[PDB]
A paper describes a structure:
Lipid flippases actively transport lipids from the exoplasmic leaflet to the cytosolic leaflet of cellular membranes thereby creating and maintaining an asymmetric lipid distribution between the two leaflets. Most eukaryotic lipid flippases belong to the P4-ATPases subfamily of the P-type ATPase superfamily (with the sole known exception of ABCA4). The P-type ATPases share a common architecture with three cytosolic domains that are involved in the autocatalyzed ATP hydrolysis: the nucleotide-binding (N) domain binds ATP, the phosphorylation (P) domain contains a conserved aspartate residue, which is phosphorylated during the transport cycle, and the actuator (A) domain contains a conserved glutamate, which is responsible for the subsequent dephosphorylation of the phosphoenzyme intermediate, that enables the protein to return to its initial state5. Here, we present a total of nine cryo-electron microscopy structures of the human flippase ATP8B1-CDC50A complex at 2.4 to 3.1 Å overall resolution, along with functional and computational studies, addressing the autophosphorylation steps from ATP, substrate recognition and occlusion, as well as a phosphoinositide binding site.
The ΔCter-ATP8B1 construct was incubated with nucleotides (ADP or the non-hydrolyzable ATP analog adenine-(βγ-methylene)-triphosphate (AMPPCP)) and/or AlFx to stabilize forms similar to E1-ATP, E1P-ADP and E1P conformations, corresponding to autophosphorylation from ATP and subsequent ADP release events. The cryo-EM structure of the ATP8B1-CDC50A complex in the presence of AMPPCP mimics an ATP-bound E1 state and reveals the ATP binding pocket of ATP8B1. As expected, AMPPCP is bound similarly to other P-type ATPases. The adenosine base is stacked by a π-π-interaction with F596. Additionally, D554 is directly engaged in the coordination network of the ß-phosphate, mediated by R652. Indeed, the R652 rotamer state is constrained by interactions with D554 and D734. Noteworthy, the D554N mutation has been identified in patients suffering from PFIC129. Interestingly, extra density was also observed at an interacting distance to the ß-phosphate of AMPPCP, suggesting the presence of an additional cation or a water molecule (see Supplementary Discussion). However, closer inspection of all E1 states along with the outward-open E2P states (autoinhibited and active conformations, see further below) reveals the presence of a density at the canonical, phosphorylation-coupled transport site of P-type ATPases between TM4, TM5 and TM6. Due to the geometry of the site with no more than four ligands, we modeled the site as a water molecule.
Residue numbers in the entry:
A (entry chain A): 106 to 174, 328 to 481, 493 to 773, 795 to 812, 836 to 1183
B (entry chain B): 24 to 351
């Protein structure tokens, strides 16, 4: 409910609990230098607005229940450090003035008969009591609405990702989604991108192309329509006559077995109601392979628990299914056990050649040229799935079958107990051949991979596919150009061993997963082993991050999140992981920013991500437009938020000298309330949502603008103290120009604005106009609502202030509203307006001069292209 | 997942907007235009302020050889100073008479807060129940102090008068009127007497005078519109100053019936009852006569500031112009 709401809002956030601790300080009257109004009202709104951003979710959840029945940004870490820095500065300044009041009180205060209160407090005690007085007057240094404004900034910026129409894929009709509304500025700080290959850099819209059985490559043009076969369809374009008549007539046991495997080892669900024998495959490889198998008469009709309904050229032969060896990223190969009606136990298997060749029979004359065949298909970016088969003796199958059934002992045992059965049977395998299937790069991926590389984002691709296919796909998508000097694990391994023992343009690291583990080898002895682990692991990353591109092959999900961790820990570089399919979810959680392509493999690795658009092409806009703008819009917000608050309170610090360091507020008591929430809150928010350094089209054409965020040039821990130096000066001008103007005569007559009330109206008035004019200088996109908010802020202040100082309000609160007749008297006098104009001109013109010099002497890339409109 | 996003200007980040860039042809004219605006205003205010005629008589007597130093140790409560000043140039039009206090922190937190606002607003409940805010002076002995607070208690209670020494040497008093020396709102809205009755004696029942005040607030003036919380002198005091060294309106010298100057140049004597002690905290009292000006008062700082900033802006434009010229 709401009671939990404020309960964790206070404790979790330091600033929220800081102000609650302040109310206790303001409650006791012996030190309360400000009214309680000054903190609750700015607090309730901040605690009220944030409730609306979360309560609306809960009520929707409550309605949902009726109907049906961590990642922290880099700036988020800095913001915490800034607020803890403001605490120390506040405590030092409050302690500094507490010293000044004790010494003032000892000399001047004790000798002043008009400041007699009847409490014999020694000057050391009076200084101590006002130490808490300057923790209250100067409390507003800590920005109360920082933690609520940033949520609105990030939520609004994130919602531009959802509503984006350029990041919307039409035919599949799935727009971009931003499922984490707290990682926006970090899209503009990404140094690395880890990407899957299949399903991310390829469409997974597959089609059967070629083949090879027993060393004879098929699928070429030698010696077409499949009208001879009823099950066939024209969707498959095939030009290989010899195999067509051979499979049609004069069939051999080789082609029969090979095509039969493709239509038996499958796991695709099948439907026949439509009459076309429709297929719905969870794995694109299986669906396309079976869709290709049916085109040649080997059509799979139906399946049940104990049998199948496969057909061969109209010869519907039903087999008996006994066991299916399941597939996962670890196994990298699938197998099926089927008993023929003849009574023979035939085992079929398919998968990567790497894991299948190691388990081949000793006699295999076709092994050599088949490897050459496999290499031939990979040369054209065709995925290859090796096949094989074996026979099981009836005598030895009985005990194994009983053990297989016994392997299903429930509990967690099935995780490895089944595997023990898998490896105890797969000993000798008879090679059959390999398949060849075509996947095509998504639209505008070569444009994107080239574009992002221009922004100095090192594109690493982590793919479980073969060594050769990844290397050629890297060439296809411009990731690796003709200038790349590729190297493998052995080259890396030799270098690491050479240096390890001794101490005891474009380049690539195309390395297999097997060689990834070999280099890393995945009381005193344990410590040395750990030291060795860190040494080589650190050497690898420094060796890998030094090259523009990296290709990782034969990598299981464990080896994907592992590599992402290596860059994160040992390079301190922000990482983005983009992928599809469950195999990548391990790395999507590890990466700083997790992106998920909807893809064809499954709608699984996007709900476990941060952004879930449809195609890799859209990564141009996520980083170079949404991520890049979100960084500058957030930094511009912070560069001004500290200024407008740290230039507000410091007048209390300067006015402390001319009032005995007595903690007297230079402003109206009811102006401190509304300043943080009302006068200077709307314009800064509208900036962080509607600001654009350059147009969206012009930010893609110049990806180099992204570099401002990677290096963190717009909001450092150094630019925090340049906004504070800005805050100190602005408060120095805002105070000493009115002070200089009132020490002398200022419209002194029957209606003389020389008192203290006109001193708060002059400083507050020039303060409201200055900040609301300095925000106008910040915004580079003066939309017709940025102007309304800026002028609304200034016009709102002069509207409420007149009402507050109007005689009518005096009836409601004679005590709480005690400024009557100041606004309507302190601003009709020209000298007050001549002081405000001077206080604003001399406070803003130096900013314009400073800003203009920076443009002319050290122009930034954003300004350089902004000068040239074309 | 969902449908096509709507195509609106706000949603697609395509709101029409002007992109102002600080081109060298834009900042320069405003910098030079400011130079041509501040300077004429700066010289305008400066010469206008330098025209104002003012005389400041420091009559605290702290320095020896001032012939009323006796008042720093007032064995007898009524002490008097007679300070003579001569005006080189006669005053014209209305002449405003102020009293100045220096090194007098009227902006102290313990001071500015020490007051009851409902009591001054004319609240019957607060008349006999001063707020806790004016704690040190809530009540004198048994019943509450009507103007409570450290502000109303420490009220400037000198009696300034001006005499004209003509050729006959007889001092001719010059008319000083105490009415109309406070903000219209302060007299008419903020400050009010307690309600009910017609005689001020019956309104302030069960209330004493403040401890420092010699006489009660009942008869601060003979005028029924100037006695009580709506007294002009008292209101002018409660209007707390912004800085230690301030000066408050005391009396008005309006235009004479005849064409002659209101304060003709000649020998004048300031007859003041030294009642306010300020020498304890090195506070200085002054009597200031000033002449009205159409453009505010005598504010030389603004005139010098506008000229100072006006020249800086003009120079900054030239400096910025040179940098643009070289780096064009
Ligand atoms: C004009 O104002 C001054 C100060 O603003 C008045 O001097 C103050 O007089 C009061 C007495 O009325 C002093 O309070 C106490 O007086 C008793 C004697 O009754 C004495 O024993 C205490 O020690 C205490 O002084 C007060 O101290 C004194 N101010 C200072 C700074 O000492 C003055 O009386 C006023 N005169 C008129 C005519 O209003
Ligand atoms: N149902 C399946 N049956 C047989 N082999 C499969 C298979 N699915 C994938 N393979 C093969 O296993 C190897 C790696 O597959 P894995 O399950 O690890 O995901 P993947 O690598 O195909 C996704 P990506 O290509 O994007 O990296 C590939 O060589 C592939 O030929
Ligand atoms: C001031 O004027 C008075 C009265 O005219 C006179 O008695 C006194 O001596 C004068 N003092 C000085 C210093 O001129
Ligand atoms: C000053 O004023 C007092 C009070 O009215 C009066 O007694 C005195 O004669 C005047 N002149 C002086 C003190 O020179
Ligand atoms: Mg994939």
């Amino acid at each position: 409910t709401f009671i939990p709401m404020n309960l964790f809002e206070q404790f979790k956030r330091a600033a929220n609990l800081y102000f609650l601790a302040l109310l206790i300080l303001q409650a006791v009257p012996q030190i309360s230098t400000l009214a309680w109004y000054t903190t609750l009202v700015p607090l309730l709104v901040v605690l009220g607005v944030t409730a609306i951003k979360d309560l609306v979710d809960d009520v929707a959840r409550h309605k949902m229940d009726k109907e049906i029945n961590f990642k922290r940004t880099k700036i988020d870490y800095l913001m915490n450090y800034m607020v803890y820095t403001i605490f120390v500065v506040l405590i030092l300044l409050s302690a500094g003035l507490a010293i000044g009041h004790a010494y003032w009180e000892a000399q001047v205060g004790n000798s002043s008969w008009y400041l007699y209160d009847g409490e014999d407090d020694t000057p050391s005690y009076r200084g101590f009591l006002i130490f808490w007085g300057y923790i209250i007057v100067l409390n507003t240094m800590v920005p109360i609405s920082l933690y609520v404004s940033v949520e609105v900034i990030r939520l609004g910026q994130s919602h531009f990702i959802n509503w984006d129409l350029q990041m919307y894929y039409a035919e599949k009709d799935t727009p971009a989604k931003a499922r984490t509304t707290t990682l926006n500025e970090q899209l503009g700080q990404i140094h690395y991108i880890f990407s899957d290959k299949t399903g991310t850099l390829t469409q997974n819209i597959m089609t059967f192309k070629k083949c090879c059985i027993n060393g004879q490559i098929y699928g070429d043009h030698r010696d077409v329509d499949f009208s001879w076969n009823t099950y066939a369809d024209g969707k498959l374009a095939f030009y290989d006559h010899y195999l067509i008549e051979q499979i049609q007539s004069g069939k051999e046991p080789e082609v029969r077995q090979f095509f039969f495997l493709l239509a038996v080892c499958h796991t695709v669900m099948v439907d026949r109601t439509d009459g076309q024998l429709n297929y719905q495959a969870a794995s694109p490889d299986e669906g396309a392979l079976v869709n290709a198998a049916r085109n040649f008469g080997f059509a799979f009709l139906a399946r049940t628990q104990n049998t199948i309904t496969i057909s061969e050229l109209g010869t519907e032969r039903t087999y008996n299914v006994l066991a299916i060896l399941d597939f996962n990223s670890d196994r990298k190969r699938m197998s099926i056990i089927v008993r023929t009606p003849e009574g023979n136990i035939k085992l079929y298997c398919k998968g990567a050649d790497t894991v299948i060749y190691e388990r081949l029979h000793r006699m295999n004359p076709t092994k050599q040229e088949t490897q050459d065949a496999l290499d031939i298909f990979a040369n054209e970016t065709l995925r290859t799935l090796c096949l094989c088969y074996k026979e099981i003796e009836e005598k030895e199958f009985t005990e194994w079958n009983k053990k297989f059934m016994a392997a299903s002992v429930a509990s967690t045992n099935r995780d490895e107990a089944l595997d023990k059965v898998y490896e105890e049977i797969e000993k000798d395998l008879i090679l059959l051949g390999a398949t060849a299937i075509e996947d095509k790069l998504q639209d505008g991926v070569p444009e994107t991979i080239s574009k992002l590389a221009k922004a100095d984002i090192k594109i690493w691709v982590l793919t479980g596919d073969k060594k050769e296919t990844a290397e050629n796909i890297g060439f296809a998508c411009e990731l690796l150009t003709e200038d790349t000097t590729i190297c493998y694990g052995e080259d890396i391994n030799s270098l690491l061993h050479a240096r390890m023992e001794n101490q005891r343009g474009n380049r690539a690291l195309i390395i297999t997963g097997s060689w990834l583990n070999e280099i890393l080898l995945e009381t005193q002895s344990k410590r040395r082993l750990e030291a060795k682990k860190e040494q080589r692991q650190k050497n690898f990353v420094d060796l890998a991050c030094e090259c523009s591109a990296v290709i990782c092959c034969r990598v299981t999900p464990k080896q994907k999140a592992m590599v992402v961790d290596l860059v994160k820990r040992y390079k301190k570089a922000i990482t983005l992981a983009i992928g599809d399919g469950a195999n990548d979810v391990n790395m999507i959680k590890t990466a700083h920013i997790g992106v998920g392509i909807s893809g064809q493999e499954g709608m699984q690795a996007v709900m476990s991500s941060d952004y879930s658009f449809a195609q890799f092409r859209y990564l141009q806009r996520l980083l170079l437009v949404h991520g890049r703008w979100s960084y500058i819009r957030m930094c511009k917000f912070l560069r001004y938020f500290f200024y407008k608050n740290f230039a507000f309170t410091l007048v209390h610090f300067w006015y402390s000298f001319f009032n005995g360091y007595s903690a007297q507020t230079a402003y109206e008591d009811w102006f401190i309330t509304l300043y943080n929430v009302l006068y200077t809150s709307l314009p800064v928010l509208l900036m962080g949502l509607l600001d654009q350094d350059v147009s969206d089209k012009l930010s893609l054409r110049f990806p180099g603008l992204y570099i401002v965020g990677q290096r963190d040039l717009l909001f450092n821990y150094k630019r925090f103290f340049v906004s504070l130096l800005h805050g100190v000066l602005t408060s120095m001008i805002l105070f000493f120009i009115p002070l200089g103007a009132y020490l002398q005569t200022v419209g002194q007559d029957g209606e003389a604005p020389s008192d203290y009330q006109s001193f708060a109206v002059t400083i507050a008035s020039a303060l409201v106009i200055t900040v609301n004019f300095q925000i106008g200088l910040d915004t580079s996109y003066w939309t017709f609502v940025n102007a309304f908010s800026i002028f609304g802020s200034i016009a709102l202040y002069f509207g409420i202030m007149f009402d507050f100082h109007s005689a009518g309000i005096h009836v409601l609160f004679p005590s709480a509203f005690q400024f009557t007749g100041t606004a309507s008297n302190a601003l009709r006098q020209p000298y007050i307006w001549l002081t405000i104009i001077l206080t604003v001109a001399v406070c803003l013109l130096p900013v314009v001069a400073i800003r203009f010099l920076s443009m002319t002497i050290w122009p930034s890339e954003s300004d350089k292209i902004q000068k040239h409109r074309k | 997942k969902t449908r096509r996003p709507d195509n609106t200007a706000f949603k697609q980040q395509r709101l029409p907007a002007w992109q102002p860039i600080l081109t060298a042809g834009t900042v320069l004219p405003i910098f030079f235009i400011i130079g041509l605006i501040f300077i004429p205003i700066g010289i305008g205010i400066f010469v206008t302020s330098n025209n104002i005629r003012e005389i400041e008589i420091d009559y605290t007597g702290t320095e020896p050889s001032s012939p009323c130093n006796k008042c720093l140790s007032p064995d007898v409560t009524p002490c008097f100073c007679t300070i003579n000043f001569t005006l080189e140039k006669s005053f014209e039009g209305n002449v405003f008479m102020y009293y100045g206090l220096s090194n007098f922190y009227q902006n102290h937190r313990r001071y500015v807060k020490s007051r009851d606002d409902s009591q001054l607003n004319g609240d019957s409940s607060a008349l006999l129940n001063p707020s806790k805010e004016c704690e040190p002076y809530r009540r004198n002995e048994d019943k509450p102090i009507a103007p409570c607070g450290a502000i109303a208690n420490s009220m400037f209670n000198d009696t300034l008068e001006l005499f004209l020494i003509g050729n006959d040497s007889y001092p001719i008093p010059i008319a000083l009127k105490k009415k109309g020396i406070a903000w219209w709102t302060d007299k008419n809205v903020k400050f009010r007497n307690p309600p009910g009755g017609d005689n001020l004696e019956e309104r302030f029942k069960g209330t004493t005078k403040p401890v420092n005040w010699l006489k009660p607030v009942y008869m601060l003036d003979s005028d029924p519109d100037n006695n009580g919380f709506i007294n002009e002198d008292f209101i002018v005091w409660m209007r707390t100053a912004a800085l230690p060294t301030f000066r408050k309106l005391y009396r008005l010298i309006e235009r004479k019936s005849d064409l002659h100057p209101t304060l003709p140049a000649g020998r004048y004597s300031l007859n003041v009852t030294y009642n306010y002690p300020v020498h304890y905290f090195d506070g200085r009292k002054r009597m200031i006569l000033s002449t009205i000006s159409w453009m505010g008062g005598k504010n030389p700082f603004l005139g010098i500031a506008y000229i100072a900033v006006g020249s800086i802006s003009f120079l900054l434009g030239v400096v910025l112009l040179v940098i643009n010229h070289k780096y064009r």
